């Protein structure tokens, strides 16, 4: 690494909404970062819901009734 052409570095605590906490290095000088996703893949549930959201023939029938 060079002398000072890069930003500073300091410990960083990343706290999530559900209560989870991570510790890692970053560039934020505040030392604490609030995030909206914990160590759990909400992507999984989002995909599980939107794979069901699909469907056009079932919708046409569900509307048809006859």
């Amino acid at each position: 690494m060079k002398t000072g052409i890069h930003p500073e570095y300091v410990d960083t605590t990343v706290q999530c909404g559900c209560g989870h906490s991570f510790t890692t290095r970053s560039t934020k000088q505040s030392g604490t970062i609030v995030v909206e996703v914990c160590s759990q893949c909400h992507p999984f549930y989002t995909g599980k819901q939107k794979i069901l959201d699909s469907g056009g023939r079932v919708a046409r029938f569900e509307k048809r009734y006859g």
């Binding site: 909404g17 559900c18 909206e36 989002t46 939107k50 794979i51 699909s54 056009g56 919708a59």
Partner: protein, 116 residues
């Protein structure tokens, strides 16, 4: 008062005040404010400093703070875009999402009535 970055009305029912956001509907705002305790009768001008803090803290549990919904929806769409589900390529090329009209109507999604 001010919020985390979204502008809200002053004397409109809390439901419509929070629904004015592009990503929150009327029923969504109602069911979100009910859990926090902000009845739909009280207005946005008579709120307390803690009523905004509790609202922000709750809209992170089930739903997402304004900036968080902004960092949800667009790349939600972008992921389901090709090679994802057919709805992706339906939304990309500006095509009826649920099979709306194409020529005679549905000009809202197709664009303005250009003077051609």
């Amino acid at each position: 008062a001010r919020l985390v970055g979204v502008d809200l009305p002053r004397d409109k029912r809390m439901e419509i005040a929070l629904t004015y956001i592009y990503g929150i509907g009327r029923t969504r705002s109602n069911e979100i404010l009910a859990a926090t305790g902000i009845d739909k009768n009280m207005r946005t001008k008579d709120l307390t400093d803690d009523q905004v803090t509790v609202l922000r803290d709750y809209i992170e549990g089930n739903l997402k703070v304004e900036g968080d919904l902004r960092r949800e929806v667009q790349a939600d769409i972008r992921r389901k875009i090709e090679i994802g589900c057919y709805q992706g390529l339906r939304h990309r090329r500006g095509l009826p999402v649920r099979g709306q009209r194409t020529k005679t109507n549905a000009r809202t999604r197709k664009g303005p009535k250009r003077t051609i």
